[PDB]
Nucleic acid binder design. Structure first.
Ligand SMILES: [Zn+2]
Lengths: 64, 97, 63
RNA sequence: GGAGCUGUCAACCGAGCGUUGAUCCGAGGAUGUCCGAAUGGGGAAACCCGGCACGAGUGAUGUCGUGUCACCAGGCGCUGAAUAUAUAGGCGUCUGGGGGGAACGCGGGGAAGUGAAACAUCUCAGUACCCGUAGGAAGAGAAAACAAAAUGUGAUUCCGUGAGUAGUGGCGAGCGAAAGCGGAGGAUGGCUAAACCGUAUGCAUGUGAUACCGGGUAGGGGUUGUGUGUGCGGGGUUGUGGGACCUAUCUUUCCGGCUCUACCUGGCUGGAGGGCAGUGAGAAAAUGUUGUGGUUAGCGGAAAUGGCUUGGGAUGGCCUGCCGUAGACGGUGAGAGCCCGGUACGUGAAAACCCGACGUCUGUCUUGAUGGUGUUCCCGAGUAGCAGCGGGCCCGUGGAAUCUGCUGUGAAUCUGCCGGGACCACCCGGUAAGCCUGAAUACUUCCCAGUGACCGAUAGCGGAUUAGUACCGUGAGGGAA
RNA sequence: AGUGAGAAUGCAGGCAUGAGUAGCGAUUAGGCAAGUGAGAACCUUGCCCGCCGAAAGACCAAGGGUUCCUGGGCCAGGCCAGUCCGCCCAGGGUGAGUCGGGACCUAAGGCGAGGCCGACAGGCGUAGUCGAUGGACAACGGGUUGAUAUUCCCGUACCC
RNA sequence: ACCGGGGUAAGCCUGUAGGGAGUCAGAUAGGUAAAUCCGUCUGGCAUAUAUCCUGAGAGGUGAUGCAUAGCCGAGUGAGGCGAAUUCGGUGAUCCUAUGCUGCCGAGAAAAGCCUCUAGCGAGGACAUACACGGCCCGUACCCCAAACCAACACAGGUGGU
């Protein structure tokens, strides 16, 4: 995973692009697991927490 | 802010003999979000796979109801979309076959 | 017809005592009268319900 | 906080995280689908259909996000029908409400079984239930009170007596006070209305001049002359009656504009020291520092690997030592102060909240107090009182006082009025028809810490196990093992 | 002291007597050969016989909810046995512009802004808004799967 | 002699049996305003197998397609070929038919569609071709039954085609 501390060092633009990459990778991992070719299960959890972290920093940056 | 992504509506494919038989005929079956609609699925599929989609058909399936020691369970109900691609016919190689 | 639109007077409850001293419930209602009263000397009248005491005191003005 | 962890039934497989601090515990934030007061509209709750504004996406329609759109009440602004003044009504915008909750409060409505060995008065019982409404408590509360000749008490509430008494009762069954006396808490607390001034304004109007500030000299001719109502500011809060007027005496700061305008004499208003109060009933909204003050996680914490013996195992028996501000309670392979969690006793707060303290800040008094003398005005109105019909009081209409509901009738402002159990006279007490107020008292849905000559699985909660579950009923509802 | 049970047509649980007894749920009816299997009157296949045939055939609505198909199972259930099952386990399966409904319309009726009435709680009801069992409105034939087909595919149409 | 075939839809053409209907001109506010529309009143011309509308069905096309009686071989099972299809009789409770003729008991509403003005309007109308958009719910299975109502795999009950 990528640390929140280094997540706050980016602007809203690269934050949104990283969020888009995270969503795409989650899509691919879901399809991989459905087809049964995914050995490392924790990728799903890590990418989910990553999406959540990006949303959280975005919301905090908007607020204060 | 919320970032809307077409991929949040397509959950996973359906792996079965009927689905594979349709696959051979260029018809792909996905499990979609329960409150989607056919136009939205069409748009999302075109954006995701950069392909031209002819038509989509949807069906709702209720979850099965199983017995347990504690009592009666009930699996999750799902909605499927059976999506047919146009004559252009670029297969979905990321389907995993 | 039992509550005054001005002073909020309401019915009183009590008992009706017979000769054998049987007590049954009853109501003492207010003497509530319909008045077409005015708010200003202009002359437009509205219909309301006022008890006779409110009319006596001049709280409502017919005009 | 510190070495494992990925909740559990409940493991098995597969994958990973952690001394660069995980899982875990506390506090503050973010997200929070749809239903539900449910509120854009609809509806068979959790599911159907939208409008508007801004974005996204398509060749465009389709499609997707983010906000917003109920109703009523109250301010504010615009408009003002029949209709002229106008009003209803309409339009726009801001502020509130709606529903839930175990008990406790207050205010209303209000049974019957039952007892009376029948039954209607009466009882049950103002109970069960229902309705409206709160608050952390509520209600009541500052004498139109008691009392009885005592040169007596002195708001309210609650507790014990008084007392199963006086009484009340088809004088049947039953019901049943108060004064006084002993305590808890103490705030014998606080403001208003009126008489009179001033000012502002609404409505009427002018011997439009000898009337509008205290005298005199004077100017103009409106502090509109006058009534009247209303708001505000003074002034007044009382029972030996008090107060506004009028009236003498002594007088604890400076300056300015004002008593229609200036000049000497009496009044009103701002600013500077100084005093007194403040989150309170007596007015309210904030802002700083501080307290090893509290609450919400924790941490430390003495002393046996003792010997023999029985035993699967010692925590049993016998024999040795030690700690003790710690010999509470549990666990560990059988009765453990010395093996573990702990215990006595000490320590710990980034943050949030809760308490206090000192301040900024606010208000109020300072143009101010005093002790006196004689008269007019004021002291809460459709009220008190009276009558009719009821309720409640120990009191069931009785000679029926006090309190109170509805309908009529309907007074005075202190040599007045109300109470001292019909009523009258005299004496005594008080000063109604305005409003606020803490503590003593009642209760536990919920949270923490404890206790039991309480239960130990047909008991104890219905529920130690899938528990308001399975099952039963159309439903309200019943309800296990 | 929740202190003593033999009885209250007492309560809960376990188990006897009747008793290896009555029944085993219509008015059609089964038989043989072969097979599978540890096990066959009941399961599979074949050849016969019998029954319904305005049904005991076929297709729907209400209702039910996975009972449907494939693979497996055989201690519970099936009024016997069971290799079978509507039973148990896992996986799969329901495809619509034109069909039945909503996004169209109203009836009976329901709710009901304001509103009127009523001590309170509430009763009615206007404007509206819902409410099919009715009105309006565009698809027919053939084929395919182990399970869907006016939905998928082929041919040929229609309506916004 | 006997046995088996002796098939094929919506739609689009055409408009038959049957059923129904006069047309034009003027005036007029009664239809909340206005109307060329609807009523009403006047006239003219009309009785025509004339015209218009509706309309079962027969016929053509859809169909060089689909389907079929049969015939072949293969084997877990896959697949190919495929004849003739005319003429009559009988005959519906279905269609014309929301028709027609009788009768008294006198037999929904709103939407939709057509027309009329009020009103908007510099763009608008029609045809052809091409490329697209067609939303939400049900859809399995039983359904006179061992799958629904009946405590049961129950001699009962269950609306329609
Ligand atoms: Zn009144």
């Amino acid at each position: 995973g990528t640390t929140p501390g280094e997540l706050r060092e980016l602007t809203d633009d690269e934050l949104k692009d990283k969020l888009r990459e995270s969503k795409e990778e989650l899509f691919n991992l879901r399809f991989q697991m459905a087809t049964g070719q995914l050995s490392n299960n924790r990728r799903l959890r890590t990418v989910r927490q990553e999406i959540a972290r990006v949303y959280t920093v975005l919301r905090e940056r908007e607020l204060g | 802010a919320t970032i809307t992504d077409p991929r949040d509506i397509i959950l996973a494919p359906v792996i079965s003999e009927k689905s594979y038989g349709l696959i051979e005929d260029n018809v792909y079956t996905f499990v979609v979000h329960p409150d989607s609609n056919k136009t939205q699925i069409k748009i999302a599929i075109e954006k995701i796979f950069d392909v031209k989609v002819d038509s989509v058909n949807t069906a709702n399936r209720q979850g099965k109801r199983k017995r347990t020691r504690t009592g009666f369970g009930k699996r999750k109900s799902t909605k499927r979309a059976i999506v047919k691609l146009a004559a252009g016919s670029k297969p979905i190689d990321l389907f995993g076959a | 017809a039992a509550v005054c639109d001005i002073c909020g007077k309401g019915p009183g409850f009590g008992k009706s005592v017979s000769h054998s001293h049987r007590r049954t419930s009853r109501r003492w209602n207010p003497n509530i009268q319909p008045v077409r009263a005015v708010t200003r000397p202009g002359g437009n009248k509205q219909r309301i319900n006022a008890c006779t005491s409110c009319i006596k005191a001049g709280k409502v003005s017919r005009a």
